[PDB]
Amino acid sequence: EYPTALYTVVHNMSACPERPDSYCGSNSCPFKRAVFSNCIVNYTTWVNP
Amino acid sequence: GCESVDFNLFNTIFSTHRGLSNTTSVITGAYPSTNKSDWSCLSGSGFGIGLYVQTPRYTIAVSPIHVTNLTWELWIHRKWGVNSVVTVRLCRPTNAFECLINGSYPTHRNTGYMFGVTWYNDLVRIVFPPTVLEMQLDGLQWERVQFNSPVNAGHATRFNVVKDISTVLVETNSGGSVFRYSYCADGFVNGLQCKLRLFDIPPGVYSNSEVEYPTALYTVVHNMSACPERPDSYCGSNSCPFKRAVFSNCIVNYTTWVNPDQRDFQHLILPNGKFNPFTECNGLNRIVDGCVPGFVLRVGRGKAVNRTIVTPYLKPYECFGWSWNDNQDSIYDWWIADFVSTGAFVCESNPEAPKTGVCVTYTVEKVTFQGVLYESNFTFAQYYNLLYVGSQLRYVRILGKVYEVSSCFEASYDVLYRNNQSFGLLYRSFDCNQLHIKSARFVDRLLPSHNGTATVLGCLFNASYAPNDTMVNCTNPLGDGFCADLLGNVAVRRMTFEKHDTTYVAPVTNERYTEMPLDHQLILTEQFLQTTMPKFSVSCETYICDVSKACKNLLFRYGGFCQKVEADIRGAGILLDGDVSSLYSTIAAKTSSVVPTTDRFNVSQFFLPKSRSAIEDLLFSKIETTGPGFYGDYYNCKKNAIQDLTCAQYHNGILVIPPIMDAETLGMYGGIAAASVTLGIFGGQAGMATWSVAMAGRLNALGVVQNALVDDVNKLANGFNQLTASVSKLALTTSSALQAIQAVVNQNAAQVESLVSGITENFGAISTNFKVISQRLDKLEADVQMDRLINGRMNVLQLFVTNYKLKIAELRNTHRYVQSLINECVYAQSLRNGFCGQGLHVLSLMQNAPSGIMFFHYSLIPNNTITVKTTPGLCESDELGSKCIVAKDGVLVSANLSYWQWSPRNLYKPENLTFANVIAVSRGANYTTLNKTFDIP
Amino acid sequence: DLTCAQYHNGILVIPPIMDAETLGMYGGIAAASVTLGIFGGQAGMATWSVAMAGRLNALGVVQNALVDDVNKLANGFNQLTASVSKLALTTSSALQAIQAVVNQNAAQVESLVSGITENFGAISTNFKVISQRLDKLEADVQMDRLINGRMNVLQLFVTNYKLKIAELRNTHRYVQSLINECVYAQSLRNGFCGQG
Amino acid sequence: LFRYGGFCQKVEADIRGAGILLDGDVSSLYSTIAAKTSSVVPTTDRFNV
Amino acid sequence: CVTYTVEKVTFQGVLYESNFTFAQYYNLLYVGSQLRYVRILGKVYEVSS
Numbered sequence A: 001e002y003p004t005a006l007y008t009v010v011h012n013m014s015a016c017p018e019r020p021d022s023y024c025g026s027n028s029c030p031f032k033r034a035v036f037s038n039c040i041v042n043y044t045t046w047v048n049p
Numbered sequence B: 001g002c003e004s005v006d007f008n009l010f011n012t013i014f015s016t017h018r019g020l021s022n023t024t025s026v027i028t029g030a031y032p033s034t035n036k037s038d039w040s041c042l043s044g045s046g047f048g049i050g051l052y053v054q055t056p057r058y059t060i061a062v063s064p065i066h067v068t069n070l071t072w073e074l075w076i077h078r079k080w081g082v083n084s085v086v087t088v089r090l091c092r093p094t095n096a097f098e099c100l101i102n103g104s105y106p107t108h109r110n111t112g113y114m115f116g117v118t119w120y121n122d123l124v125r126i127v128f129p130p131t132v133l134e135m136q137l138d139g140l141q142w143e144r145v146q147f148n149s150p151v152n153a154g155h156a157t158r159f160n161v162v163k164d165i166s167t168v169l170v171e172t173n174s175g176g177s178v179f180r181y182s183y184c185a186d187g188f189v190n191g192l193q194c195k196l197r198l199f200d201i202p203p204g205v206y207s208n209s210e211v212e213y214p215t216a217l218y219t220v221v222h223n224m225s226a227c228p229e230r231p232d233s234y235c236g237s238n239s240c241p242f243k244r245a246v247f248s249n250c251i252v253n254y255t256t257w258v259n260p261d262q263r264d265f266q267h268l269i270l271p272n273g274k275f276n277p278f279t280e281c282n283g284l285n286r287i288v289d290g291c292v293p294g295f296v297l298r299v300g301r302g303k304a305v306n307r308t309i310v311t312p313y314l315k316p317y318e319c320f321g322w323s324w325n326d327n328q329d330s331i332y333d334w335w336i337a338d339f340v341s342t343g344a345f346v347c348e349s350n351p352e353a354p355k356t357g358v359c360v361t362y363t364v365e366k367v368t369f370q371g372v373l374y375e376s377n378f379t380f381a382q383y384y385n386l387l388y389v390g391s392q393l394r395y396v397r398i399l400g401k402v403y404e405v406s407s408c409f410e411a412s413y414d415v416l417y418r419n420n421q422s423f424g425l426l427y428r429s430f431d432c433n434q435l436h437i438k439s440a441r442f443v444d445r446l447l448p449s450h451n452g453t454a455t456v457l458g459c460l461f462n463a464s465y466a467p468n469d470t471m472v473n474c475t476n477p478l479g480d481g482f483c484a485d486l487l488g489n490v491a492v493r494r495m496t497f498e499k500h501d502t503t504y505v506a507p508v509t510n511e512r513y514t515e516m517p518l519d520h521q522l523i524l525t526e527q528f529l530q531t532t533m534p535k536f537s538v539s540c541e542t543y544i545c546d547v548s549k550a551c552k553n554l555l556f557r558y559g560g561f562c563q564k565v566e567a568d569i570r571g572a573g574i575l576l577d578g579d580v581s582s583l584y585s586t587i588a589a590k591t592s593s594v595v596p597t598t599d600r601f602n603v604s605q606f607f608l609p610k611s612r613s614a615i616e617d618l619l620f621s622k623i624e625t626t627g628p629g630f631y632g633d634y635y636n637c638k639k640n641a642i643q644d645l646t647c648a649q650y651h652n653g654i655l656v657i658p659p660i661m662d663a664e665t666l667g668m669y670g671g672i673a674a675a676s677v678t679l680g681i682f683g684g685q686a687g688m689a690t691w692s693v694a695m696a697g698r699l700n701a702l703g704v705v706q707n708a709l710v711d712d713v714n715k716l717a718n719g720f721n722q723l724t725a726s727v728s729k730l731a732l733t734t735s736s737a738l739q740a741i742q743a744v745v746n747q748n749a750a751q752v753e754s755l756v757s758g759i760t761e762n763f764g765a766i767s768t769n770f771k772v773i774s775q776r777l778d779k780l781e782a783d784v785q786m787d788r789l790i791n792g793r794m795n796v797l798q799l800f801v802t803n804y805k806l807k808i809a810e811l812r813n814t815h816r817y818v819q820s821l822i823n824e825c826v827y828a829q830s831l832r833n834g835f836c837g838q839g840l841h842v843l844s845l846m847q848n849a850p851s852g853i854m855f856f857h858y859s860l861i862p863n864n865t866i867t868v869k870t871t872p873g874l875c876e877s878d879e880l881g882s883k884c885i886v887a888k889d890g891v892l893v894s895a896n897l898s899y900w901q902w903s904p905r906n907l908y909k910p911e912n913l914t915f916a917n918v919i920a921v922s923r924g925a926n927y928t929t930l931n932k933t934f935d936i937p
Numbered sequence C: 001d002l003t004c005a006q007y008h009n010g011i012l013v014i015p016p017i018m019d020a021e022t023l024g025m026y027g028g029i030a031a032a033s034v035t036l037g038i039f040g041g042q043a044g045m046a047t048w049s050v051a052m053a054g055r056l057n058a059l060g061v062v063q064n065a066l067v068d069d070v071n072k073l074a075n076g077f078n079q080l081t082a083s084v085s086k087l088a089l090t091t092s093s094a095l096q097a098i099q100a101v102v103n104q105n106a107a108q109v110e111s112l113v114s115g116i117t118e119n120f121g122a123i124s125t126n127f128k129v130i131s132q133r134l135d136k137l138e139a140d141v142q143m144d145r146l147i148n149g150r151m152n153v154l155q156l157f158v159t160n161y162k163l164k165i166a167e168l169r170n171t172h173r174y175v176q177s178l179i180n181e182c183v184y185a186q187s188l189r190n191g192f193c194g195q196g
Numbered sequence D: 001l002f003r004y005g006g007f008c009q010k011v012e013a014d015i016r017g018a019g020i021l022l023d024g025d026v027s028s029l030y031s032t033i034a035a036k037t038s039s040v041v042p043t044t045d046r047f048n049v
Numbered sequence E: 001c002v003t004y005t006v007e008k009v010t011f012q013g014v015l016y017e018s019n020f021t022f023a024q025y026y027n028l029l030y031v032g033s034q035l036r037y038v039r040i041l042g043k044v045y046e047v048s049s
C-alpha cells in the first residue's frame, strides 16, 4: 500500500476578480455575472466579514 | 493557387488529446482548409464554425446572426503589432452588457506564426502555439465572422473561415510536437491514410474501407394533422375552471402560442433561430428542433415583480417556457410541456419523401439503417410502418406508400495499393452485370469507379483480372483462391500451390510400368508450434480500482467478479504450469556420454548452444516488436537475455511471472532440460560412431541408398548445411513460420495494450480517481459515474481473462500435439507420412522460439521420376516349385531394358543383381518368367 | 462470375484464402489427387481393379484377388456410396455436424444484427436524436446505454470468432494429419482412419 | 468512442489477427491437399468413383 | 514511489526530474502506451515504474 498525491491542476495558478457589485435586479438595472477559471479563491472573501 | 500561403506551418496548431509521442494519430475537429482560394490573396465576411489566420514576413469579430440585448459575442483586437498586441473580450466601444473575459495573452509576431479559434458545437477553443483556452457555453452559438485587416502588410496578409469538420491524421516527433499531417478529404490515398493510422503506407491489399453517406431522418411517417392552439390562459385552476391542452400529432408553429406583439419576445428567441418556447427544462433540451414526443400543455397567467419572473419547480422530465412581458404591467403567460411517453411525436413540417435510388442512411421509427430505397407494390398490413423478414429490414412504408429497401452494395471498397498513381479498387460486394449497371434503379447510384469486371471476388476497378495464368508467391493473398500482384500495373491473379507427392509406395505385383524417382532433394519445413505464454497473477481488487477504499467496499457487489477472476487466472495458470511441466518432462532426454562427433554436418555451430543457440538468437533478431511499451520492454529484455537480472513486469495489479520452464530463456539442447541432439537419429541404443555413419544408416533405413559411402553422405551434408544456413536469409514475409511467431507477438502485444488502455482511459467518467469522482458529484449521480468506469475496467479485465483462457485451451491440446511430435518425430523416426514433413523423413531438430517451439524437419522430396518396369520377382521355369528369386531390401527393376536389375525402394540406382541383393523364395504370386536360367550361383 | 461477400453496417465478410465450398475437391488448381492415395507415390498401376486387388493383398484379406473378389468389393463400394443420397439430417451424425456448424454460424450473425437493430433501452438508435432531445448529462447516460451494448454484442462476436479460430487451429493439425496419412497414405494406425 | 478503454483498436486488430491466423492455416491446409496425381489417370472398371 | 493523478489520469510510480523539455501543450506525455514524462509546475518530471 502506497500513499497518494492529487494534482488536478499542474501549471502555476493566478487569481480572479472577487464577488461582484451585488447591485439591483438584472432587468431594471444592468447587472453582470462573473467568471472563475484559474483562480486561487478564498471562498470567504465572497462576503463581508 | 495563391501568392503566399504557408502550408509547412499548419503543424504548429494541431494537437492530439494527451501527449502521444512518436507514432501517428488521427484527430477530428474544426481545422483550417486545404483550399488555396479560401485564404486571401482587407475586410472579410463569412459564415462558419471557427477561423484561422497567420502572418508572413487583425481585428476579428465573431457574433451570432440575431443579436439581442443579452447575447454573447467576441472580438479580438490588434494595433500595429508589438506596440499594442492583443486584447480579447466577450461582451456587447460600449461595455453595455455581460463581459466574461478580459485576457491579453500577448503573442510573438514572427516570420511564421499561426493561430485561430473554433466554436464547433459550442466547444469554444482559442488556440495559440503555446497554449489553448477551452470553454463550453450553454446559451452560445456563433455563425458570423467579421474579419478585418491592418492597413498594409509586406506580403499578403491572410485569413480563413472554416466551413465544416475535418478529421486529419497527425504525426508527432520525440517532443510530442506535430510535424506532418494530411487532411482526409484532399485526395483519395489520404482517405485510407486516415483509415489505417500510417502515413506512407506500404503496398498491399487493404480491406473494408468505407464510403461516407449523407443521412435522412424520419421520426414520423404518416401524414400529419394539426392541433388546437394555446389555451384560453384564464385565471387559476382552483378559483375558476381551467384546462390543459394535449399535443399528439400536430404540425405546430411554436410562435402561434403567443400574441405577435411585433418582435417583443426576448426569451423565446435564439441568437440564430426563432422561438424555442422552452426557456428552461429539466432533463432534456431547452433547444427544440426536429420532432419531440407528445405532451399535454399546462398554461398559467399570473402576476410578477419588475420584469423578473421565477421559474417554478417542475417534474424531472417536463419542460417550461413563458412569454408576454412588455405590456406596461407585470403579468405574463407561462406554460409547461410534460413530454410523457405519448409515442405520438409532435412537430412541424411532416416529412416529404425519400428520393428513391439513392443509398443514404435512414432512421424510420427509431430504427436506423443504411441502404438504398425503392418503391414497392404489394401493400402489407395497416400496422407496422416498417417490417422485418427474419432479421433483415426489407419493407418500409413512408407516407402511406410502401418503399422496399435493398442493401447498399457500394459502401465497402478494398483498395489494393502499389503507390499514389497506381492502385485498384475492389468492391467485395456489388457484382457488375451489364444489364445491372445500365438499369433504371442504378442511374443515381453509380460512380466512375463502377465500370469494372464482374469477378467472383466482386467488382475490381482500374486493374486487370486474367485468371488463366497463375502465380505462386502469394505475398498478399486476396481470398477465394485469388492473389494480387504488385510488380507493374496492379492485377489480380489466381494463386496456386506446390504439389505434394506422398511417400507411401504401393506394394508391387503383376509387373507394370512403375515410375521411380531418379534423385531427391532436401527440403527444410520449419514448423512453429506455440507452446508457452507468460503466467499471470492478476489482482482485480487493485486493478479495477487503486488505493481508493471507496471502490473496495463497493466492488464486492458485482456478482462475485473479483473472486472469480483471481481464481480463474490461478486455475488457468496452474493448468499452464502442469502442462509446460509435462512438456519438459518429455524433452529432457538421455543423450550418451560418448557425444558422437560430426564430420561435415555443421550442427554444433547452428543448433547447439554457444547460452542459447545461433539459430534462435538469429531468430529473435528477425522479430520486430510493434512499438515501445510494456510488452516491448518485456520482450526486449527477454530477447537479449542479459544474465543475473529479471524482467517480470508488475504494473497496477498485474504481475507477469515466467512459467515453470520458460522456453526463450533456456537454450534447447543445453542446460538442465537438455534435449539430446544425438538421441533422435542415433537411436535409443547409442554407441554409433559419427553423424556420418548415422546418416548412412538412416539412408539405408528409409531406403534411398543402401551402404552409403562418403559421397552420398557428403552430398547430403552439403545439402544440409547449405539449407540450414538459409535460416538466416529469410525475412518475415514469405516465411510462413516467422509470420506465426510475429502473429503470436502481435496478439500478445495488442492484448497488453488493451489491458493498459483499460486502466488509462476514463470510460466517460469525469476522471480516473475515485476520490475525485466522490468529492465532486452527487450522492447518486456519482454512483452512475462510478459504475461507468468500474464496469468498464471490469470489462477490460474480463476480456483479458477470457483471451487468456481460450489461449490456454488452445495450448492444452497443442501441447498434446507438441509432445506427440517431439517424442515421435524428433526422438524416434516416424512411420507416419505427413506427420513429420513432406515425404521421406531424414532428421528433425527442434529449437526454441518466442512463446513457442519450432521444428526443423529435414525431408527428401523427389523431383525427377524415371519410369521403369518392376516385377515382384523373376522365375525361369513355368512349373510350380521352380527356383525363383526376389530382391533383398529393394525392388527389381528394368529401364525398358532386356534384363532385370536391382534398385532401392525409393530411389533408382540400378545394379546387376547378384547373390548379395537377391533372396530366393517361391512361386507365391505370379512372378515374371524371364525364360532363361540364372547368371548367379 | 458474381460474388456473395455481404457487407452490412461495418462488417465486411470476405472469403478466406481458399474457400472450401466454392472449389471442387478433386478438380481445379488445388487438385486433391483421387488416384494418389491408393495407387501410391510410385504410380504406373493399371486400373482401380488391380489397385484394389493389390490393396486387399496388402491388408491381408485375400491374396492374388481375382475379378470376383474385387467386383464383390466393387458392388459393395457403389451400393454403399450411392447410399450417400438416402440419409437425412437426423440419424446421420455427420449431417448433424454440418447443420450444427450452420446453425451456430447463423445464430451468431443474427445476434450480430439484433445488436444493431435494437435500442438497449435507449430512446432510439440514432445518436443525433438522443443528442437533440435529452439533457447535457442524461443524454450521456442514454448514449452509454447502447454504445455500451453494441460494444458488448461486437465483443461477444469477436470472442466467439476467436475461440472457433483456436478450435480450427488444432483441428487443422488433425485434418492435415488425417489427409496425408489416411487419404494419401495407408495408415497403420487402428482407429485413426476408420473402424477396423 | 475512444474513451472506452481502447476498445475499437483492440477489436479491429484482433479480427485482423485471427483473420491472418485463419489465412495462413487454411493456406497450410491446401498446401497439403494439392498433390501430384500422374498423367496416366488410371481408369476404373466397376468403381463408380 | 507514491501514486499520482495528473490531469484526470491516475497512475502509480516513482517520479524523478528530467532535462529534455518537450512541447508546450500536453502536461503529461505518452510514449506508445506507457506514461513516461509529466510536467508538473513548469518543469518536466520523468516517471519510471
Ligand SMILES: *[C@@H]1O[C@H](CO)[C@@H](O)[C@H](O)[C@H]1NC(C)=O
Pocket: A012, A013, E041
Ligand atoms: C507561482 O505563483 C506565485 C504567485 O505569483 C509565486 O509566489 C510562486 O513563487 C510561483 N511558483 C513558482 C515555482 O514560480
Ligand SMILES: *[C@@H]1O[C@H](CO)[C@@H](O)[C@H](O)[C@H]1NC(C)=O
Pocket: A042, A044, A045
Ligand atoms: C481568506 O481571507 C481571510 C480574511 O482575513 C484571511 O484571514 C485568510 O488568510 C484568507 N485565506 C487565504 C487562503 O488567503
Ligand SMILES: *[C@@H]1O[C@H](CO)[C@@H](O)[C@H](O)[C@H]1NC(C)=O
Pocket: B001, B034, B035, B036, B037, B038
Ligand atoms: C477549394 O474549394 C473550392 C470549392 O469547394 C474548389 O473549387 C477549389 O478548387 C478548392 N481549392 C483547392 C482544392 O485547392
Ligand SMILES: *[C@@H]1O[C@H](CO)[C@@H](O)[C@H](O)[C@H]1NC(C)=O
Pocket: B069, B266
Ligand atoms: C433592449 O434594448 C432596447 C434599447 O434601449 C430597449 O428599448 C428594449 O426594451 C430592450 N429589451 C428588453 C427586453 O429589455
Ligand SMILES: *[C@@H]1O[C@H](CO)[C@@H](O)[C@H](O)[C@H]1NC(C)=O
Pocket: B089, B095, B099, B102
Ligand atoms: C480590460 O483590462 C484593461 C487593463 O486591465 C482595462 O484598461 C480595460 O478597461 C478592461 N476592459 C474591460 C472590458 O474590462
Ligand SMILES: *[C@@H]1O[C@H](CO)[C@@H](O)[C@H](O)[C@H]1NC(C)=O
Pocket: B021, B022, B173, B174, B175, E031
Ligand atoms: C522517436 O523516434 C526517434 C527515431 O528512432 C528516436 O530517435 C527518438 O528517441 C524517439 N523518441 C522517444 C521519446 O523515444
Ligand SMILES: *[C@@H]1O[C@H](CO)[C@@H](O)[C@H](O)[C@H]1NC(C)=O
Pocket: B223, B224, B399
Ligand atoms: C398531407 O396532408 C397535407 C394537409 O392536408 C396535404 O396538403 C398533403 O398533400 C398530404 N400529403 C399527401 C401525400 O397526400
Ligand SMILES: *[C@@H]1O[C@H](CO)[C@@H](O)[C@H](O)[C@H]1NC(C)=O
Pocket: B253, B255, B256, B348
Ligand atoms: C407561423 O406563424 C407566422 C405568423 O405570421 C407565419 O408567418 C409563419 O409562416 C408560420 N409558420 C409556419 C411554419 O406555418
Ligand SMILES: *[C@@H]1O[C@H](CO)[C@@H](O)[C@H](O)[C@H]1NC(C)=O
Pocket: A025, B305, B306
Ligand atoms: C421593483 O422596483 C421597485 C421600485 O424600483 C422596488 O422598490 C422593488 O424592490 C423592486 N422589486 C424587486 C423584487 O426587486
Ligand SMILES: *[C@@H]1O[C@H](CO)[C@@H](O)[C@H](O)[C@H]1NC(C)=O
Pocket: B419, B420
Ligand atoms: C505519395 O504521396 C504522398 C502524399 O502526397 C507523398 O508523401 C509521397 O512521397 C508520395 N509517394 C510517391 C511514390 O509518389
Ligand SMILES: *[C@@H]1O[C@H](CO)[C@@H](O)[C@H](O)[C@H]1NC(C)=O
Pocket: B421, B422, B423, B449, B462
Ligand atoms: C486509374 O488509373 C490511372 C492510371 O494509374 C490513374 O491515373 C487514375 O487516377 C485512376 N483512377 C481511379 C479512379 O483510380
Ligand SMILES: *[C@@H]1O[C@H](CO)[C@@H](O)[C@H](O)[C@H]1NC(C)=O
Pocket: B437, B438, B451
Ligand atoms: C464502361 O466502359 C466501356 C468501355 O469504355 C464503355 O463501352 C461502357 O459504356 C462503360 N459503361 C458505363 C456504364 O459507362
Ligand SMILES: *[C@@H]1O[C@H](CO)[C@@H](O)[C@H](O)[C@H]1NC(C)=O
Pocket: B465, B466, B467, B468
Ligand atoms: C481466359 O481464357 C479463356 C479461354 O481461353 C478466354 O475465353 C478468356 O477471355 C481468358 N480471360 C481473359 C481475362 O482474357
Ligand SMILES: *[C@@H]1O[C@H](CO)[C@@H](O)[C@H](O)[C@H]1NC(C)=O
Pocket: B472, B473, B474, B498, B734
Ligand atoms: C516464390 O516461390 C518459390 C517457389 O515456391 C520460392 O522458391 C520462393 O522463395 C518464393 N519467393 C517469394 C518472394 O516468396
Ligand SMILES: *[C@@H]1O[C@H](CO)[C@@H](O)[C@H](O)[C@H]1NC(C)=O
Pocket: B510, B511, B926, B927, B928, C066
Ligand atoms: C498376374 O495375375 C493377374 C490376375 O490373374 C493378371 O492380371 C496379371 O497380368 C498377372 N501378371 C502377369 C505378369 O501376367
Ligand SMILES: *[C@@H]1O[C@H](CO)[C@@H](O)[C@H](O)[C@H]1NC(C)=O
Pocket: B519, B520, B521, B522, B863, B864
Ligand atoms: C532435382 O533435385 C536435385 C537436387 O537438388 C537437383 O540437382 C536437380 O536439378 C533437380 N531437378 C530439377 C529438374 O530441378
